[PDB]
Design an enzyme around this catalytic site. Structure first.
Site, PDB file in Angstrom:
ATOM      1  N   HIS A  41       0.827  -1.230   0.000  1.00 17.91           N
ATOM      2  CA  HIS A  41       0.000   0.000   0.000  1.00 17.91           C
ATOM      3  C   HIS A  41       0.857   1.274   0.000  1.00 17.91           C
ATOM      4  CE1 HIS A  41       0.026  -0.252   4.555  1.00 17.91           C
ATOM      5  NE2 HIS A  41       0.131   1.067   4.399  1.00 17.91           N
ATOM      6  N   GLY A 143       2.550   6.079  10.306  1.00 15.46           N
ATOM      7  CA  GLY A 143       3.920   5.904   9.808  1.00 15.46           C
ATOM      8  C   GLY A 143       4.577   4.611  10.270  1.00 15.46           C
ATOM      9  N   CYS A 145       3.665   1.418   9.618  1.00  8.43           N
ATOM     10  CA  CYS A 145       3.479   0.266   8.698  1.00  8.43           C
ATOM     11  C   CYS A 145       4.843  -0.207   8.197  1.00  8.43           C
ATOM     12  CB  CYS A 145       2.524   0.585   7.561  1.00  8.43           C
ATOM     13  SG  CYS A 145       0.802   0.547   8.122  1.00  8.43           S
TER      14      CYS A 145
HETATM   15  C1  LIG Z   1       0.483   2.328   8.390  1.00  7.90           C
HETATM   16  C2  LIG Z   1       0.288   3.012   6.989  1.00  7.90           C
HETATM   17  N1  LIG Z   1       1.531   3.822   6.409  1.00  7.90           N
HETATM   18  O1  LIG Z   1       2.305   4.183   7.274  1.00  7.90           O
HETATM   19  O2  LIG Z   1       1.647   4.026   5.211  1.00  7.90           O
HETATM   20  C3  LIG Z   1      -0.795   2.414   9.244  1.00  7.90           C
HETATM   21  C4  LIG Z   1      -0.647   1.947  10.690  1.00  7.90           C
HETATM   22  C5  LIG Z   1      -1.925   2.288  11.535  1.00  7.90           C
HETATM   23  C6  LIG Z   1      -2.207   3.802  11.565  1.00  7.90           C
HETATM   24  C7  LIG Z   1      -2.569   4.134  13.052  1.00  7.90           C
HETATM   25  N2  LIG Z   1      -2.191   2.919  13.893  1.00  7.90           N
HETATM   26  C8  LIG Z   1      -1.836   1.848  13.055  1.00  7.90           C
HETATM   27  O3  LIG Z   1      -1.490   0.720  13.407  1.00  7.90           O
HETATM   28  N3  LIG Z   1      -1.859   1.673   8.458  1.00  7.90           N
HETATM   29  C9  LIG Z   1      -3.069   2.165   8.107  1.00  7.90           C
HETATM   30  O4  LIG Z   1      -3.460   3.289   8.418  1.00  7.90           O
HETATM   31  C10 LIG Z   1      -3.998   1.272   7.261  1.00  7.90           C
HETATM   32  C11 LIG Z   1      -3.687   1.473   5.772  1.00  7.90           C
HETATM   33  C12 LIG Z   1      -4.357   0.431   4.855  1.00  7.90           C
HETATM   34  C13 LIG Z   1      -3.668  -0.929   4.961  1.00  7.90           C
HETATM   35  C14 LIG Z   1      -4.400   0.940   3.390  1.00  7.90           C
HETATM   36  N4  LIG Z   1      -5.372   1.551   7.627  1.00  7.90           N
HETATM   37  C15 LIG Z   1      -5.885   1.302   8.893  1.00  7.90           C
HETATM   38  O5  LIG Z   1      -5.122   0.818   9.732  1.00  7.90           O
HETATM   39  C16 LIG Z   1      -7.414   1.635   9.219  1.00  7.90           C
HETATM   40  C17 LIG Z   1      -8.397   2.150   8.374  1.00  7.90           C
HETATM   41  C18 LIG Z   1      -9.660   2.314   9.048  1.00  7.90           C
HETATM   42  C19 LIG Z   1     -11.011   2.796   8.671  1.00  7.90           C
HETATM   43  O6  LIG Z   1     -11.239   3.254   7.361  1.00  7.90           O
HETATM   44  C20 LIG Z   1     -11.934   4.528   7.199  1.00  7.90           C
HETATM   45  C21 LIG Z   1     -12.021   2.795   9.653  1.00  7.90           C
HETATM   46  C22 LIG Z   1     -11.740   2.334  11.008  1.00  7.90           C
HETATM   47  C23 LIG Z   1     -10.459   1.880  11.382  1.00  7.90           C
HETATM   48  C24 LIG Z   1      -9.401   1.863  10.392  1.00  7.90           C
HETATM   49  N5  LIG Z   1      -8.037   1.459  10.469  1.00  7.90           N
END
Ligand SMILES: *[C@@H](C[N+](=O)[O-])[C@H](C[C@@H]1CCNC1=O)NC(=O)[C@H](CC(C)C)NC(=O)c1cc2c(OC)cccc2[nH]1
Ligand SMILES: *[C@@H](C[N+](=O)[O-])[C@H](C[C@H]1CCNC1=O)NC(=O)[C@H](CC(C)C)NC(=O)c1cc2c(OC)cccc2[nH]1
Lengths: 305, 301
Positions: A41, A143, A145
């Site tokens: 992603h 950040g 991930c």
């Molecule tokens: C890493 C993404 N990056 O750094 O590029 C984060 C790690 C999350 C953010 C806050 N705490 C964590 O562990 N990953 C994400 O934000 C992830 C990305 C997808 C895999 C594309 N999404 C979520 O973790 C997420 C999305 C939702 C949502 O959608 C509107 C609703 C409710 C909960 C939720 N969690």
């Protein structure tokens, strides 16, 4: 003595953490030999993440769209492929700090160290368990991930987890290093719900053996039980049933205390079917379920790496 | 989101851990530049440890009596001295992995990461607090002495602890890197008791803030209290006084959560008076006191 949540020392994993950026999206990657592994992603914008088509988004990307950095040092990307939810980026430099390693897929109940990372850069280390519902009760901000979870098997780092997402309940979900999710989760900006969680029975037994080793054994009763009868009773309490591997890995603690696995089970069956009165085990009224048998021996025996 | 007991990454300290042998006693040293720091009780025998006169024991030693091992490589000791309870071994090789570093003495209530080592090899990393009675609740076996505690700021490792002792109560005692003990302890083979241990109030409040940030609000109330009234009750339960400084350092967590520090004090006073009635906070059945406001900010902002 003392009994703590202990992480493996993180140095061998620290020398493998890099930053991966595609346009404005930055997250963490793992640099082993001449390949960087990260969550796929990284190729998405905010709006793409809603319901991406990863084959379609990747076909439009070339090596020169990927910025890989070791601190502020660029490593050139000379190849890319997608393997499930992980991106593999071939780079022009073999990581001189590559440890001996394996990619492992862990069982629920197994623990590992997480090296929490931000912009490639290690920030913190803590001990986690894979819950029975394939979540981890982690600690992760934006950040994070591509942060990895690992065990050390002497000189060998076993990578078992890469971080991808937070469920609405504030627990965490991710993949093995071949990009297959633990549990039914998908990498999409979608609120996903985990299964009802259960207590990890093998880990509670390991903790009971730890107590006995420390001469706190009041909870030993005179009964035994079958594995099957115990497994049927334990599921009524929201407890995970025991596998033949679970019995086998309790072997050393059984040998050291002289208490059969099935006698300890019968002791723990009375704890659930009765409670603690107001009594304590290792100073606690809560039964701990995030120490594995190996965690109990490693720490009670001072195993090194 | 989520809250975990989190240690600093250990790599910058792992690169400094060496094995130190004198006669039949092996333990861990810290190799920074051309000096190896280790506990001085490594010069002692099973006789000496009962009542050691360390000035005498040390003048009777030469360099060649000290075997330092960094991985497979023996280091040549070209000099030795003693600063309080720490032995300094001059060697002919500077450690190329020496990070930027300081020696600090920490205060009670402050936290640090411990890298537990055996024979110069890292076993484990965990987070500890210096208790008000200058003990730590660690996890340390035979061979662990010379294991260090540390904080990392930017690229600077602040070393604050070297491990020397287990008390009969099963808690742990040791020194700063200038070899002064935290608390009234001595590097002798004797049973030593600590002062009565108090709870670190400012840390319990920070953790209640962590709990609220993670959606856990059951213990909150619409009572408030003065600082003095909170302190009268805290002290009755063997909690440390909360100072205005402590109140100020909670500011950022108060602002994030919109709960005034004195309203959180009112929650804590109800928890001390009524107990937790079988309920849990961030998965604990007990009030956690080994997270500082900064530990909470770092992890929850
Ligand atoms: C890493 C993404 N990056 O750094 O590029 C984060 C790690 C999350 C953010 C806050 N705490 C964590 O562990 N990953 C994400 O934000 C992830 C990305 C997808 C895999 C594309 N999404 C979520 O973790 C997420 C999305 C939702 C949502 O959608 C509107 C609703 C409710 C909960 C939720 N969690
Ligand atoms: C480190 C020594 N080493 O070479 O690695 C030891 C720390 C371990 C011991 C097991 N748990 C730990 O934290 N340090 C010692 O063993 C220390 C040595 C003196 C400072 C010279 N002694 C004790 O920790 C000790 C002695 C003692 C006692 O004496 C009769 C009675 C009750 C409790 C005691 N603890």
């Amino acid at each position: 003595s003392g009994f703590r949540k202990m992480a493996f020392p993180s140095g061998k994993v620290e020398g493998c953490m890099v930053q991966v950026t595609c346009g404005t999206t930055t997250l963490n990657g793992l640099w082993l030999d001449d390949v960087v592994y990260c969550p796929r992603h990284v190729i998405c914008t905010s709006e793409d993440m809603l319901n991406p088509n990863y084959e379609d988004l990747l076909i439009r990307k070339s090596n020169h769209n990927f910025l890989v950095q070791a601190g502020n040092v660029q490593l050139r990307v000379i190849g890319h492929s997608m393997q499930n939810c992980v991106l593999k980026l071939k780079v022009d430099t073999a990581n001189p700090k590559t440890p001996k390693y394996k990619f492992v897929r862990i069982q629920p109940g197994q623990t590992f160290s997480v090296l929490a990372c931000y912009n490639g850069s290690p920030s913190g280390v803590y001990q986690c368990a894979m819950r029975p519902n394939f979540t981890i009760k982690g600690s992760f901000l934006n950040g994070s991930c591509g942060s990895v979870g690992f065990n050390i098997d002497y000189d060998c780092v076993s990578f078992c987890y890469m971080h991808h997402m937070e469920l609405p309940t504030g627990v965490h979900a991710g993949t093995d290093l071949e990009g297959n999710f633990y549990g039914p989760f998908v990498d999409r900006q979608t609120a996903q719900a985990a299964g009802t969680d259960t207590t990890i029975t093998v880990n509670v037994l390991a903790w009971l053996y730890a107590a006995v080793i420390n001469g706190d054994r009041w909870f030993l009763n005179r009964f035994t039980t079958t594995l099957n009868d115990f497994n049927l009773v334990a599921m009524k309490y929201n407890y995970e049933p025991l596998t033949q591997d679970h019995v086998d890995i309790l072997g050393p603690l059984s040998a050291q205390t002289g208490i059969a696995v099935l006698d300890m089970c019968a002791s723990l069956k009375e704890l659930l079917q009765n409670g603690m009165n107001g009594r304590t085990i290792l100073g606690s009224a809560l039964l701990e379920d995030e120490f594995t048998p190996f965690d109990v021996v490693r720490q009670c025996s001072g195993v090194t790496f």
